[PDB]
Amino acid sequence: SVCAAQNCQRPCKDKVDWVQCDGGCDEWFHQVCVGVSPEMAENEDYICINCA
């Protein structure tokens, strides 16, 4: 499964993490492909640069 970030990779391994943007696009990213750090997305509303 591929998510919608500019420079994304399709990992498809056992367990991979995703983030939803709360800045408007409501699309899913992988934490690594949209430059999210786990702590940040689980702490604050995550707003991709596209919605920023």
Partner: peptide, 9 residues
């Protein structure tokens, strides 16, 4: 945010 983890294979 809204997070998730998809488990494959």
């Amino acid at each position: 945010a809204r997070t998730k983890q998809t488990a494959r294979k």
